[PDB]
Amino acid sequence: AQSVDQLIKARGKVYFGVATDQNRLTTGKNAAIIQADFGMVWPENSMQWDATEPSQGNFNFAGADYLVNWAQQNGKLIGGGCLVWHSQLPSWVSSITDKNTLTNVMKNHITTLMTRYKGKIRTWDVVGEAFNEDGSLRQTVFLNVIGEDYIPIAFQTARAADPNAKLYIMDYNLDSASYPKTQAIVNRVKQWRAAGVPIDGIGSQTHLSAGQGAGVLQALPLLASAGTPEVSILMLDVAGASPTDYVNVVNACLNVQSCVGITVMGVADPDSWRASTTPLLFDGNFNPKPAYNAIVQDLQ
Numbered sequence: 026a027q028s029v030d031q032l033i034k035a036r037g038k039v040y041f042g043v044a045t046d047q048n049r050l051t052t053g054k055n056a057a058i059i060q061a062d063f064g065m066v067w068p069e070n071s072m073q074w075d076a077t078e079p080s081q082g083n084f085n086f087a088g089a090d091y092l093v094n095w096a097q098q099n100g101k102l103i104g105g106g107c108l109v110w111h112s113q114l115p116s117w118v119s120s121i122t123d124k125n126t127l128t129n130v131m132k133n134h135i136t137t138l139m140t141r142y143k144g145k146i147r148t149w150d151v152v153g154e155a156f157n158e159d160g161s162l163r164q165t166v167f168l169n170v171i172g173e174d175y176i177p178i179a180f181q182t183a184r185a186a187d188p189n190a191k192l193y194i195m196d197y198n199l200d201s202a203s204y205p206k207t208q209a210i211v212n213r214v215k216q217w218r219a220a221g222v223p224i225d226g227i228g229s230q231t232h233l234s235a236g237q238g239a240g241v242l243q244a245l246p247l248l249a250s251a252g253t254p255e256v257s258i259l260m261l262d263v264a265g266a267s268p269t270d271y272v273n274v275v276n277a278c279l280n281v282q283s284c285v286g287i288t289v290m291g292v293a294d295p296d297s298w299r300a301s302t303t304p305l306l307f308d309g310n311f312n313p314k315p316a317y318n319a320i321v322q323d324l325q
């Protein structure tokens with residue numbers, strides 16, 4: 026019944042974290058497990074663009090406010106995001122075709138969310154899923170209308186709104202060192218940072234199939250070679266939840282000096298987006314699964 030967050034702090038890392046929101050914190054044993062075992066919380070949905078600005082200039086913070094207040098009262102660090110992510114856009118954003126108009130909408134969205142929680146958020150995921158699988162930039166509304174400067178603009182705008190935040194770019198399928206996407210994000214982040222773009226971290230959205238944990242041992246050092254101050258594992262779940270896959274991911278974290286922590290996608294299996302693959306660390310009784318105990322043994 027040991028706390029993985031307490032144990033990973035003992036190994037010199039910052040946090041073992043989890044995604045949650047108001048609808049989980051108010052039912053079952055989610056809050057008790059988060060209180061005991063995790064040191065950082067993220068809003069699964071309540072800070073996404075469609076949740077917070079469902080119509081232009083009309084903001085909804087009730088869910089995000091609840092999460093931030095709960096975390097502060099319970100001694101937890103807070104991550105927020107995603108500020109710019111095409112798959113969470115409300116419909117009104119995608120029909121804007123003017124560069125100046127979309128730039129202003131994007132900056133206003135960033136600045137409004139970050140100002141409301143200024144000083145309270147350790148990490149912001151500023152841009153997500155900006156890359157195609159071949160390493161090219163994904164042709165989203167932001168790329169199509171603003172161009173590739175939208176990423177520099179988003180990060181500079183975020184730094185100005187809350188300079189004490191750690192600003193991350195995140196993506197998925199960065200789990201293999203030989204995959205073109207993994208190399209591409211490293212090379213682009215190096216170029217952006219040399220030009221003064223304030224990218225503090227790369228966050229790897231780590232949705233794994235069985236047996237893919239071993240690859241992260243080589244991919245994570247490659248991500249860290251971009252020279253960002255931090256890297257992190259985000260949104261972690263593993264089909265089958267095998268102890269071997271989870272332990273390999275934890276050990277990749279421990280092996281990479283700049284990796285500050287790990288965030289898992291959720292608490293209990295039935296609430297996973299792929300519950301049929303039983304991919305989390307607690308079962309539907311809110312009891313720890315073998316993978317949880319394997320992490321504990323590994324961290325000791």
Ligand SMILES: O=[N+]([O-])c1ccc2nn[nH]c2c1
Binds near residue numbers: 067105107153289291
């Ligand atoms: O790590 N996460 O579980 C997580 C969840 C939702 C997010 N939105 N932006 N970044 C996120 C990270």
